């Protein structure tokens, strides 16, 4: 249901200098718009830049990419399978560039590979402008894994990007799932890359770029804490809601644990979902189930999960009352308690 578009600003590229693009399904009746960022890890350094260009192709080209796509989850137009934005125009921006959407920088005689996440979402924004975007009264930033990051490092900017092109009105608004991690100690050592270490790496070899009251908080060299959830959002004007599973997969892989257990392994996933779930605590926009698992938004089966009886549909429908007092039955903040995955019977079986 979602056409290919490919940016028209062919200067805007994905890693290997092939144009970046979109695909859109319109939705004429209505003035909501869903961006999505797509995930999929990142690369660092040449070595392991060009691992990924020989097996995970279409993370880093549109060479091979196909002229539509389904719209699943929250990109649905089926209500059955999408109760909160069924009818909006329904946007996904395939995730070509590697690097967490932070990057500007080309590529060129001293660059082999492009690193463009941040201008593609610029452009893209700017070329949906034309095709009904300036109409719109919400646009939504989503995005799951690396897009879930890469929504908290760009929101401000979409914003920002539309009150300077003159649209003040459009109302800007972020959903970051499966991208709120914790820069914590791995379980057993190993750069599986850390992920303070990843991070470091990765920025200095995109140019990437962090919003600008964080990168004024942590200054030169330090910009790389811009990408732990934690310590962003509390700098961010748009309205975030946030999507994280207690005990997310992508945060286990880097902390490097892999799942009989034993004390020692016991404690350390409680402590992480512990420290998840106290991050959380003052953010009024957030689902998070003790499952482990990774990703949500774009699943069919998106609308089964459910913390304190609320699903995530609607919570999300609650978001958007509550930013016409909490509502009567329709709450936003939704952390489950108990500590240990699964311990949420409506987590997903796998
Ligand atoms: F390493 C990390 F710091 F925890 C981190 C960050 Cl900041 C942002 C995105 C990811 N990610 C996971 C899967 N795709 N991207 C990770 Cl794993
Ligand atoms: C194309 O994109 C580049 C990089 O974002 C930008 O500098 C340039 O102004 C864009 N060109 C047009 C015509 O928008």
Redesign the pocket.
């Given at each position: 249901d979602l056409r290919l578009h490919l940016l028209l600003n062919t200067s805007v590229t994905c890693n290997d200098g092939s144009p970046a693009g979109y695909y859109l399904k319109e939705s004429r009746g209505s003035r909501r718009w869903l961006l999505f960022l797509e995930?999929?890890?990142?690369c660092f350094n040449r070595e392991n830049c060009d691992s990924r260009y020989d097996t995970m192709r279409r993370l880093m080209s549109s060479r091979d990419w196909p002229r539509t796509r389904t719209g699943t989850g929250i990109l649905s137009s089926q209500p059955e399978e999408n109760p909160y934005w069924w009818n909006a125009n329904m946007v996904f921006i395939p995730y070509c560039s590697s690097d967490?959407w932070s990057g500007a920088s080309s590529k060129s005689e001293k660059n082999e590979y492009a690193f463009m996440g941040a201008l593609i979402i610029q452009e893209v924004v700017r070329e949906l402008l034309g095709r009904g975007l300036s109409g719109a009264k919400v646009l939504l930033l989503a995005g799951s894994?690396?897009?879930?990051?890469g929504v908290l490092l760009n929101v401000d900017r979409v914003a920002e990007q539309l009150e300077k092109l003159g649209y003040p009105a459009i109302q800007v608004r972020g959903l970051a799932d499966?991208?709120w991690?914790?820069?914590n100690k791995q379980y057993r050592h190993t750069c599986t890359?850390?992920?303070?270490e990843?991070?470091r790496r990765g920025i200095r070899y995109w140019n990437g770029v962090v919003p600008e009251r964080c990168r004024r908080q942590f200054q030169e060299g330090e910009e790389?804490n811009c990408?732990?959830?934690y310590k962003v959002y509390p700098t961010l004007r748009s309205p975030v809601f946030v999507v994280q599973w207690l005990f997310?997969e992508?945060?286990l892989?880097?902390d490097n644990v892999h799942l009989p257990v034993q004390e020692g392994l016991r404690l350390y996933i409680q402590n992480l979902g512990r420290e998840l779930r106290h991050t959380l605590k003052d953010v009024p926009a957030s689902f998070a189930p003790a499952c482990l698992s990774?990703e949500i938004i774009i699943r069919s089966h998106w609308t089964d999960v459910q913390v304190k009886g609320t699903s995530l549909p609607r919570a999300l429908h609650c978001w958007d009352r509550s930013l016409h007092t909490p509502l009567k039955g329709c709450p936003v903040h939704l952390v489950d308690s108990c500590p240990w995955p699964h311990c949420n019977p409506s987590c997903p079986t796998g």
């Open positions: 995930g999929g890890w990142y967490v894994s690396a897009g879930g990051t499966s991208g991690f914790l820069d890359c850390a992920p303070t990843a991070i790389w990408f732990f959830g997310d992508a945060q892989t880097v990774h």
